[PDB]
Structure formats: C-alpha cells, structure tokens
Amino acid sequence: STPITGKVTAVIGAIVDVHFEQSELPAILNALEIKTPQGKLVLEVAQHLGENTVRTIAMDGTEGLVRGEKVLDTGGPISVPVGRETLGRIINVIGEPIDERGPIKSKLRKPIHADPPSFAEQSTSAEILETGIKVVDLLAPYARGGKIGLFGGAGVGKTVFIQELINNIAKAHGGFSVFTGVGERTREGNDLYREMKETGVINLEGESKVALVFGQMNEPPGARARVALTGLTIAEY
C-alpha cells in the first residue's frame, strides 16, 4: 500500500547516496526508482550504510540529478520482463528497450537477483550440441548442459561465432536461445542487431527466439555489471 520514498541526498562519483525515511530504508540490491527530466534514472541500492542511508551506484547517467529529489523504492530488486515476449527485443539494463521497439508485455518482470539451484536442483550430464562448425563439430563438442567457453582478442570476433552458433542451434532448437551483450561496442551492437534480424533469427514481426540484451558499455559501470544478472535471470525464467 504505502509508497516508500526517501530523499536522495548525495551524489558522489557515479553513486547516489539515497537516504530514506523511518522504515523506508530500501534493501540492498532492491530496485529503486528515480524519475528525471531526461526520463527514468535507474539506481540500485548498495551497502545500506546506516543512518537510514543506503548507498547506490546508479544504472544511468549521473548528470542532471538534483540533490534531495525523492526516490521511491520499487519494493524489490532490479527487474526486466521474462517470457517469450522478450524475444526479438534489445532489453536494456534499466529494462527500457533502446531499440524503440515498444513494450512487449510479458507475464512477469522478475527481480534480477535470486537463488541458485540447490544441490538437489543442480544436476549434471554428458551431452554434445550440434554447433554446425566442423571445428566445434569435431575437435571440441559443445555441451547440452555444460558451459562452453572461448577466447581470442580483438579482431578474432568470437561474437561472430556466437551469433553463428545461436543461429545453427536455433535452426534445430526445441527451446529458445538467449544472449547477453555485456558492454559491447555500440557499433558492434547495431551490426549484431542487423545480422540477427536479417538472418531470420530475430524475426522482427514473426516469432524470434534469440533475445539479445546489451549492456551498451557507455553507461556508469553498475548497469554494465548487472546486465549479465538480468540475462541470467531471463534464461533462468
């Protein structure tokens, strides 16, 4: 019922020191809210520093923020929508799509951070995935239930292999793929967008499956960090 809100008191570095009212101290990692003239300012609480003031390093630009602006908690952790509705969209760290693709309403917008599988929920298996590249088809199988890492500096473009793997797998995937653009170069972001849309993987009007979410590398670091959290949440859903 009662909308808990406080007075964002101090902005230092890229962090906004969100004080709060009695019993209004937001929890750490909870989704705050900050409405700004530029729009929505996304701040995630940090170490609750006592004095009823919980620290926060924002997920948006520190500019323009005015001291003492009221910030009302979202009542839980940072959230992005979860479900097949996310397919074909570029979900931002704050969660506001940056492609101007309109809100694809989903069943839930779950909090980013949650529990991991228990040892009674953590299983293990030996499965090989059809990666379509003879390199990964022969010299190193990809695991249907196990991590598959990679390496290579700038110019090796492993992201190209990633998109190719996504496309080939989806071409014979009973389940939908997922991605997470942890702080990619923006131009590489747009090129990835174009290649994913035109390849048929991202069916702009159809039923796509490879929901690419990008951290965009051009924000204060908090959004970049929590982006992978968001993507893991989505894949978990």
Added chain:
Amino acid sequence: KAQPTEVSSILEERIKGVSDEANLNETGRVLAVGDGIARVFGLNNIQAEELVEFSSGVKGMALNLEPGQVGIVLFGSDRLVKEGE
C-alpha cells in the same frame, strides 16, 4: 511534577521495544550491513565469536566486538536482511 514522569515514561515508550523492555541487551539492532558485515548496536550479552540469528531468516557470526557496535559477519546474502532489523 507529574510532567517529568509522564515525559520520561512516554520517551521510554513509543520506542517499539528497542528501549522498551529489551534495551538491546539480549537481542540486537543492526545499524548497518555492508556485504556480510553487520555493525549492530545491541546484543549486550553476546560473546566474541557468536552465532546470531539476525531475525531475517539468515544466521551469521559475531566475530568482532567494538566500542558501540558489534560487527557480526552474516552467513547469508546481504539483501536477505535490512538495516535496523
């Protein structure tokens, strides 16, 4: 002179239970929680290296005591508790 007594009893009261019947001697009030740290004012009977129930469903260890607050490292996620609990 009833005013001083009434004021004192009202001041002791209206404090939920922090200074009402508890004085934080056996239970504790958590001033802040960094990551698993819990600078707690209260628990005036907890010994060093103490397992404490932080009343958020998450236990933890009181592995240092200081002048006015006890730093009780928490055995669970930081969000699982909150400041002032």
Added chain:
Amino acid sequence: QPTEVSSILEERIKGVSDEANLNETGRVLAVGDGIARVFGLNNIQAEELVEFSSGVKGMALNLEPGQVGIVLFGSDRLVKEGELVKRTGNIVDVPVGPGLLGRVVDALGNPIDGKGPIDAAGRSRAQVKAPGILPRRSVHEPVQTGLKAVDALVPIGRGQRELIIGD
C-alpha cells in the same frame, strides 16, 4: 567506561544553525588545489557549471550530503574562502559550430586563437548520451589516412573510433 565519546566524525562546521537561504548562492568553505567545497545549492543538478563570484567558473562533480564540491576550472588564486558562488544551472555549454574551424578556442568554448571572436551555431551541452544502437548503420564509407600501411593493412574507416596507442 560508561559509553563512547561524543562523536566520531563531522560534515559541516559553521554555526548559523538556522534556515537555509543558500539554495542559489553558495558558501565556499573549503577551496584549494583546484578543488573547492561549497556550502549551499541545496538541490543543484549534478555536474552543473557553477560560477565563483571572484570571476572563475566551475563544474560541480561532488555533491556530498553536507557540502557539494565544485572543480575550480582556472587559476585558483582568485578564489577565497567565503566568496559567493552563483549557480549557472546548466551543463557545460560551449558555443561550437560550423564557424569554429580555422582558429583555436579554449575547451570552454572561448575563442583564444587571438584572431578575433568566434561565431557558431550555438552553445551545446558537452556530455550527452551518444548515438545508441538505433540511428546508425555499419561504417561503410572508407577513410584514407594517406599513409600507405595506414590505409592498407589497418584502414580506419570514415566515422569510426580507432585509436593509435603507442609509446
């Protein structure tokens, strides 16, 4: 030992202990070495350009709860403690435009080339959200940096963000 001491730390010092009329003007409590603390500007927009009354401008990167600290973008000899500070209320604005070329202006926009004033399309905010994912296509137009190997082996295209790291 009945308790602890009276305190541990502090944030503010001066002793008016009354209402706050320093919402547009500031009090320069700490000022020195190109960084200055300011008392006042209750709800200033973060990173707002601010003018010190002596005559030197400044941008305010620090807005700590007690006092907000503003960088003193100039020779600090003019600033002094207690000097008034006026809020310019804007992000860094520099007149820059098609008429800027062919001269040398200060990064504060002021044309310091000494070859006369500068006329430009107007002052624009110097720190804005860059063109994101939408309104851009892959760099297709080439850029020929003249040097043979530069154009050939490592061609830096038109519009791109290449860097020349080196010793």
Added chain:
Amino acid sequence: LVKRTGNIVDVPVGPGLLGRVVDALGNPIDGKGPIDAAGRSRAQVKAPGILPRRSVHEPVQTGLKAVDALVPIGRGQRELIIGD
C-alpha cells in the same frame, strides 16, 4: 605528566666524546660516565649553502686500496654503498 624541556632536541657534542659510545641524544652507554661538551646543537642544523661551500681541493685516503685509488673519497665526497 609531560614536561616541556623547552629546547629543540640537542645532542651533547664536543671533542671529548672521543672513544665514547653515546645513545640517541648523546646519553653515554658504555659506562664511562660523563663526557665533556663543546656545544649541544639541535639535531637538524641547516647545511652550508653555496658561498659557505667549496670544492674538494684536499684529497684523503680510504685506507684499504679497495678500488680507492680508482674512485677516490675526497674532502666532502658523499660516497654511498650497498649490500645484502
């Protein structure tokens, strides 16, 4: 109680200290009793500048040949060493 000596740290100094091992400020520590003083000056004196300074016009001997004729050690030659 902390009693102010009223003087900058000064060392019992003078030619008499010859052969005596003195503590920090000059407290004798061997057990030979007092050693006379030709002045007790502060422990941080201002060194002579340019004009009151001069060249190394008078040489000396390092004693051990010790690559000393190779690299001398003359009047005021602030030489340094190093080792494990």
Added chain:
Amino acid sequence: RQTGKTAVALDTILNQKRWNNGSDESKKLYCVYVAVGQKRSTVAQLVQTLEQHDAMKYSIIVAATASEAAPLQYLAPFTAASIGE
C-alpha cells in the same frame, strides 16, 4: 590450480574403500572433505563420482559451494574439523 589436487583428493578418498570394505574398527576410517573455494559443480561431480564407486557409505563432505559468502567459507574448514573430531 588443480595439478591433480582435486583428482588426488578423489583418488585418496575412494581408495579408502580398500580398507573400509572390511569391518575392522582399528583401520576403518570415516573420511570427510571440506569445500573451500569450489564451484557447486565441482562438489556435485565429486559426490557423483563417490556414489558411483559406492562411497556414500562412510564418507562425508563439508559443503562450501562458491555461492556461499565469506562467513560460510571462513567457518566451513573449522566446522568440518569439528565433525572430524
């Protein structure tokens, strides 16, 4: 990182069955393993391998999955030692 260290632990723990298979309390050992600095997958794998050789009879495993924060880690080796005692 693991120059067989995890593998060596697996081997030594499993070979314990060579002696524990009998009934002699003189040599039968109730071994256990603490889990400092391990991702939960590694613990799952070790548990599976032990159960495969049928080592779920007389072995124990102190579990500090890398999910657990600093408190569980810095107290897990000691609590494991207490179980060992």
Added chain:
Amino acid sequence: PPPVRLFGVEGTYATALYQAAAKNSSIDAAFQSLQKVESTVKKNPKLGHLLLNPALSLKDRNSVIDAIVETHKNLDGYVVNLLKVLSENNRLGCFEKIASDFGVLNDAHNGLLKGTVTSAEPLDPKSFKRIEKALSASKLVGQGKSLKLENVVKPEIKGGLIVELG
C-alpha cells in the same frame, strides 16, 4: 574570538554555541538551560542515557530531544536550537555539555589544579594567577588535606636512576 579554541572533537558544536550566545548576552542564560538539561538527563537513568545512543532513529532523535525540552522552559534559549541541530548532526553531546561548561568557566571562572608534585583537586576561581594561587594552595593544605598523594616525589625515581646508572 572565543576565550580559547577547544580543539574540536564534537567540541565544534559547543564552540559555535558559545560564540553565537556570546553575540548575545546568553552566558548565564545559556549555561543555566544546559545545567538543567544535564540534570534532567541524570534524573532519568534510562530514557535519557540509553537515549544517548547511536541507534536512535532520526524521528526518534528529534522526538527525544523534544521530550527533553518538554520539561517546561528548562530548554530556554539557543540551547534548544543547538540540541535540535545535534539531534541529526551528532547524537552525543554530554561531553559537549561539559565543554559548554568549560567555555562558561573560560568566560568567567577559569582555574585548574596546579599539580607539580601535588595531586590535589582544588580550584582558584579568579582571573589573576599571580596572587590567589598561594592562598588557595595553603588553604587546601590546611583545610581538608584530602588524598593529594602522588605516592612520592618523582625526584626519588630521578635520584635512584641517576645513582644506578653511573
């Protein structure tokens, strides 16, 4: 300028209170409300000492300060504003109350125990320190003569070390 700077440490609040109240008369008037407040705090063992705890909430701190001020007009003067300011600035000022007393003494009373080789606990409430000192010392010796024991004169230690070290 105050009589002498109290070297901070939450004494900044007290120093400022002394300076502001010294702009006005507010000398006995300031110290009187402070003495009444300290007496009231002592008069409530709890809820006035446990009230001097960091854990008190901002609403709780303002409310406790208000309740302490509620003892009629015992919180009269600028001390009310100082107490409210501290209620969010720094919770504990009993040492600041003692510092306000120290400033009051500096303004009017002065005086402290001499010492030297005496551990006496006397006072010489007079501006001058060239006449009344001897009378105060002789009186405190010939009247009361309490536990002023430094055990022995340190010169005993001095001679013992001097002889024992050649």
